[PDB]
Motif scaffolding. Structure first.
Motif, mmCIF file in Angstrom:
data_model
loop_
_atom_site.group_PDB
_atom_site.id
_atom_site.type_symbol
_atom_site.label_atom_id
_atom_site.label_comp_id
_atom_site.label_asym_id
_atom_site.label_seq_id
_atom_site.Cartn_x
_atom_site.Cartn_y
_atom_site.Cartn_z
ATOM 1 N N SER C 75 0.801 -1.226 0.000
ATOM 2 C CA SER C 75 0.000 0.000 0.000
ATOM 3 C C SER C 75 0.833 1.274 0.000
ATOM 4 O O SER C 75 0.333 2.320 -0.416
ATOM 5 N N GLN C 76 2.099 1.190 0.449
ATOM 6 C CA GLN C 76 3.004 2.338 0.477
ATOM 7 C C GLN C 76 3.365 2.705 -0.961
ATOM 8 O O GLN C 76 3.170 3.856 -1.361
ATOM 9 N N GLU C 81 1.759 7.998 -4.305
ATOM 10 C CA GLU C 81 3.191 8.078 -4.608
ATOM 11 C C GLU C 81 3.544 7.355 -5.907
ATOM 12 O O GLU C 81 3.634 6.125 -5.956
ATOM 13 N N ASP C 82 3.724 8.156 -6.959
ATOM 14 C CA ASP C 82 4.120 7.752 -8.304
ATOM 15 C C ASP C 82 5.585 7.306 -8.247
ATOM 16 O O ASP C 82 6.387 7.952 -7.568
ATOM 17 N N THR C 83 5.916 6.187 -8.922
ATOM 18 C CA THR C 83 7.250 5.567 -8.931
ATOM 19 C C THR C 83 8.436 6.539 -8.994
ATOM 20 O O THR C 83 8.864 6.939 -10.080
ATOM 21 N N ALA C 92 14.609 4.830 1.319
ATOM 22 C CA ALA C 92 14.956 5.418 2.610
ATOM 23 C C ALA C 92 14.452 6.856 2.687
ATOM 24 O O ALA C 92 13.668 7.182 3.580
ATOM 25 N N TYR C 93 14.861 7.690 1.709
ATOM 26 C CA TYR C 93 14.524 9.110 1.578
ATOM 27 C C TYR C 93 13.029 9.396 1.469
ATOM 28 O O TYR C 93 12.593 10.485 1.841
ATOM 29 N N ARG C 94 12.249 8.427 0.967
ATOM 30 C CA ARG C 94 10.800 8.567 0.833
ATOM 31 C C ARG C 94 10.093 8.348 2.177
ATOM 32 O O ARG C 94 9.208 9.146 2.507
ATOM 33 N N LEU C 95 10.501 7.273 2.949
ATOM 34 C CA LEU C 95 10.045 6.834 4.299
ATOM 35 C C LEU C 95 10.073 5.299 4.600
ATOM 36 O O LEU C 95 9.042 4.627 4.500
ATOM 37 N N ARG C 113 -0.456 -1.431 -10.357
ATOM 38 C CA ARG C 113 0.391 -0.475 -11.072
ATOM 39 C C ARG C 113 1.735 -1.104 -11.415
ATOM 40 O O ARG C 113 2.163 -2.060 -10.764
ATOM 41 N N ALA C 114 2.407 -0.559 -12.433
ATOM 42 C CA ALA C 114 3.719 -1.036 -12.843
ATOM 43 C C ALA C 114 4.750 -0.487 -11.860
ATOM 44 O O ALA C 114 4.830 0.731 -11.687
#
Ligand code: MG
Ligand code: MG
Ligand code: MG
Ligand code: MG
Ligand code: MG
Lengths: 117, 110, 141, 197
Positions: C75-76, C81-83, C92-95, C113-114
RNA sequence: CGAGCUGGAGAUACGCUUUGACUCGGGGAUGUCCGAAUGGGGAAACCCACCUCGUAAGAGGUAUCCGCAAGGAUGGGAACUCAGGGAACUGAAACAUCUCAGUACCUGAAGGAGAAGAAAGAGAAUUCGAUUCCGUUAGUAGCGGCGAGCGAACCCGGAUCAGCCCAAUCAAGCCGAAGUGGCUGGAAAGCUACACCUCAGAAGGUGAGAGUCCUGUAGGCGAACGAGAGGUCGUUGUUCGUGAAACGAUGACUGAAUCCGCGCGGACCACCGCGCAAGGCUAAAUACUCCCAGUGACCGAUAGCGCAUAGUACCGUGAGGGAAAGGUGAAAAGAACCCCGGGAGGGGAGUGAAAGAGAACCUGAAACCGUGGACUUACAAGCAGUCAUGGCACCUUAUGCGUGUUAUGGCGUGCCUAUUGAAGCAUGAGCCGGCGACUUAGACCUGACGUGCGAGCUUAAGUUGAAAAACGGAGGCGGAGC
RNA sequence: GUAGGGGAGCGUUCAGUCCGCGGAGAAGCCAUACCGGAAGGAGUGGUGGAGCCGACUGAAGUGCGGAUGCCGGCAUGAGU
């Protein structure tokens, strides 16, 4: 910081020691005994407020049957007369009439005698 | 206990100077300085006068009456005067004597 | 001139509920606080046990804790949040900050989604979910 | 929403804290600031241990009237101060964002009244002081208000020593206490006053 | 330095000082006798000698342990350091392994620090690259009558940062800006009217409150010449308690290899990997505070050090123990003279603003002891009050209001503690004053309130600025359970 | 209404801030019949003789009748 008693106790003490007026001996001069006396005085104070109310009615009733008996009656009987003469609802004041207004008291005795027999 | 250190055992006059008395009673009165006590911060000027009693039984005759003598002060007299009143000090150099540094203010005479 | 209350350093207010007063032991005379015997000015009778249930209960057990993985939910990545891309430094930088331990992908989110995942391991239904939605899961040697 | 004084006239920038300022948050701040500044010196021989006294006394029973160990307890005149103050801190870490929100909110308070942004004291000339009073006169700084000067000019600072006026604060090393402590804020040096994040 | 000085000393006499006293900064020179104590003795501070130089006075030497000799050592240090030796109360609600704790104490050695130190290592990346310290990992791993309880290290962040050698500016001190008149007052620094300085409005003093009166402060100058191996038995260390117990360490017995060699990697084997013991030194970061300076939501005389100074008085044979005590006034102008008295003490006079400050000197509570006045009391049974009424007195929050007091009536079993049950003939207390008991700590745990950010939140040690806070993301908590 | 739990507050020292007061008299002490629902608070007067109240906020060595409590002073027994 330090915060010593200074002034607070002596003031607390003088307040008590001033309620102590015509207090005999130590009861008016030394704090612990002056204060102690007052605890017991509190009992007497709160009790004597509702007591005077019994005390006076007693005095009131005594004067009534005295005069009631002056005109060949009595409190028990007299009061029933005034009660039986529903119109009569003095209750309070009634003692002063007996004591000060004998002319008037007699009228009420005579009315009380009617409503009864 | 402390005493006259609040300054620096340092005065603003000499045992000769003429000084005016600023502050208190004897205000404005002037006089020669006759005793300077630096540590004690005392000035004996011909100013404040006192009447001192003499406790003198055996001490040279029992005739120890009252004495006329002047009683010492502090910094309650502004040192050195010339334009008729009290002043500070600023201009030093030398006179004929190099080794000595004089004193002066809005004027230039002590 | 007149008497003035004035706003500023003196007008700064507590905050209501911010901080109440402690307990000073004398709210009337009748405070001879604690119990009334056997609750004493001493240093603790204790609060745990060694029969009070804990003993009298069993096991020789054996404790381990070898490797524990960081749960990187499906789900994250999916839903929002688009690739931005997986790799290592981007996840890491995203969460998903942790160090010392490897990562793991688990099948919770369902948006399809791809996506190209770079985890250190994944569950059967996690791999068989990224591929079915389009994408690859890269596990090292 | 604020203009300028000397050097230009822009200002306008900064999204200042909503609503019409919160005293509660400033309170939280000042407290922390004063709590940090508080030195932890606590002169007390609390312990029956720390005070200078021997250890046995006048026997357990039969002395007739007593029951005492030694002359050092707090019930004794000259004994320990059992529960007295000992050296400590009160310094804690007030969350970062609250400190940032703090002074912003404090500046906002000075906008709602008397704020002041300046570009150099070319209006000063040397230290002189007498000339700072001259400059201040030009901008309504009479002495009826306590003033806080936050400049980076080492000379314009040197012209701040005077009474019921100014406290001079350097290299954007400001305080929520200092700004609330004075009536007006001469925010001056627009170095911290513009650009961050 | 530039006129005073003659120590505290509140004290007179003799004197000293611009041919520069006094004091301060820096050197020298003298330094009795005791003490490591050291010629020998000795019951410290005293006895008694010998040898050399010498006119007597007087001077120098005469201790043992190191080394040729120069030269070093003995002894003293508050705490800190390492070492040898090493408790018990206590926890385990008993106790014995275990805990308290290698703590306390004794002893040795030393310094301004010491300790440790240059991988036969940590350790699992074929990463690291001397040591100590701080954060953290982490109350994890583990130890444990698997009980009470005890408890690492690696990684990472940080302070500081070195590896070398052998054997075959700060004290003395000087300069330093700018107020005058009226008023209140005993006294001006306060009030008032105009005035200036500010690189200086920090601070002390001055008859009361001080930018501009003194000392100073910001700022500047400033000294001749002054410092900066493996083994068996026994045991033990660290999380190491006989456990599967590795490794270090060593009292007793033994006893090898020498680089196709040795030791380690938690019995043990093989493989893989890390490293070269049996020689020595090595700054900095760390610790403590006798002493010095600065500062304080520290104390202000029962506080604060035991001491506003005293380790005194007093106590003890000794080890040891151990007090309490502050205040004239702005200035001594410390009260000449008179009166009662031997004196003590007072009353005056005088000084001072005040003596309502007089040397038993600031305030001067209360207990306690008195003199005087008001109302009262000598047929009375009493937790001492309380309510009601009458009498007397008084009138400055105070004349219908009371205030004080008093007679008579009614009612009425101190307080606390402890307790089924207290007036209890149960506990405590002579009285008053002061002192005198739920605290503080920890990146601890768990909850209520609160605020800030919010699916995210947050910094620790430190670093840099400090009339002040910013930086620092190592790490911690949500985030998946079984 | 006891143990106990919960709520609202009074007072003391210190601190930061503001408003002030004071040798034409500050704190403290002393008297009082006034105010507040209580802790308490004010007016007036008397003493004192140099410092201090009020308001908000902060922090505590913050409130005493007891402990055969500690220090100090003074009583009783007793003119025995
Ligand atoms: Mg003490
Ligand atoms: Mg006193
Ligand atoms: Mg001493
Ligand atoms: Mg008993
Ligand atoms: Mg008592």
């Amino acid at each position: 910081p330090r915060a010593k008693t200074g002034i607070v106790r002596r003031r607390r003490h003088k307040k008590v020691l001033k309620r102590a007026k015509g207090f005999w001996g130590s009861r008016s001069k030394q704090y612990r005994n002056a204060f102690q006396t007052l605890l017991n005085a509190a009992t007497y104070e709160y009790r004597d407020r509702r007591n005077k109310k019994r005390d006076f009615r007693r005095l009131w009733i005594q004067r009534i049957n005295a005069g009631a008996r002056l005109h060949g009656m009595n409190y028990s009987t007299f009061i029933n007369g005034l009660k039986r003469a529903n119109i009569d609802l003095n209750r309070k004041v009634l003692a002063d009439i007996a004591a000060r207004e004998p002319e008037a008291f007699k009228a009420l005795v005579d009315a009380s005698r009617n409503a009864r027999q | 206990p402390s005493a006259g250190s609040h300054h620096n055992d340092k005065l603003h006059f000499k045992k000769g100077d003429t000084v005016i008395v600023l502050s208190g009673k004897h205000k404005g009165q002037t006089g020669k300085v006759l005793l300077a006590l630096p540590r004690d911060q005392k000035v004996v000027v011909e100013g404040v006068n006192v009447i001192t009693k003499n406790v003198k039984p055996s001490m040279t005759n029992p005739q120890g009456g009252q004495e006329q003598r002047e009683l010492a002060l502090h910094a309650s007299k502004v040192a050195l005067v010339d334009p008729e009143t009290g002043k500070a000090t600023r201009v030093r150099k030398q006179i004929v004597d190099g080794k000595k540094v004089r004193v002066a203010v809005a004027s230039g005479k002590t | 001139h007149d008497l003035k209350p004035t706003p500023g350093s003196r007008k700064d207010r507590k905050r209501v509920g911010r901080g109440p007063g402690g307990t000073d032991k004398t709210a009337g005379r009748g405070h001879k606080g604690q119990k009334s015997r056997s609750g004493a000015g001493k240093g603790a009778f204790f609060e745990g046990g060694r029969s009070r249930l804990i003993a009298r209960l069993p096991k020789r057990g054996f404790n381990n804790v070898g490797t524990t993985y960081e749960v990187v939910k499906l789900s994250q990545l999916q839903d929002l949040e688009d690739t931005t891309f997986d790799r290592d430094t981007l996840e890491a930088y995203r969460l998903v900050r942790r160090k010392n331990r490897p990562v793991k992908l688990l099948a919770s989110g369902e948006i399809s989604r791809a996506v190209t995942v770079h985890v250190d391991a994944a569950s059967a239904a996690a791999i068989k979910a990224v591929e079915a939605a389009g994408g690859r899961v890269v596990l090292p040697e | 929403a604020q203009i300028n004084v000397i050097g230009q006239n822009g200002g306008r920038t900064i999204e200042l804290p909503l609503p019409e300022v919160n005293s509660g948050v400033l309170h939280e701040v000042v407290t922390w600031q004063l709590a940090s500044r508080r030195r932890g010196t606590a002169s007390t021989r609390t312990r029956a241990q720390v005070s200078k006294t021997g250890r046995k006394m006048y026997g357990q029973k039969g002395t007739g009237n007593a029951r005492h160990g030694d002359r050092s307890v707090p019930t004794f005149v000259g004994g320990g101060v059992a529960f007295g103050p000992k050296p400590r801190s009160y310094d804690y870490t007030l969350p970062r964002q609250v400190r940032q929100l703090g002074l912003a909110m404090a500046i906002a308070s000075r906008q709602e009244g008397g704020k002041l942004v300046a570009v150099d004291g070319f209006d000063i000339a040397d230290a002189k002081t007498k000339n700072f009073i001259s400059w201040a006169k030009q901008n309504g700084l009479d002495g009826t208000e306590k003033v806080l000067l936050v400049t980076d000019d080492e000379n314009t600072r040197r012209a701040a020593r005077n009474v019921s006026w100014v406290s001079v604060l350097p290299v954007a090393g400001v305080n929520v206490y200092d700004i609330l402590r004075h009536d007006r804020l001469v925010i001056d040096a627009a170095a911290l006053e513009i650009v961050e994040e």
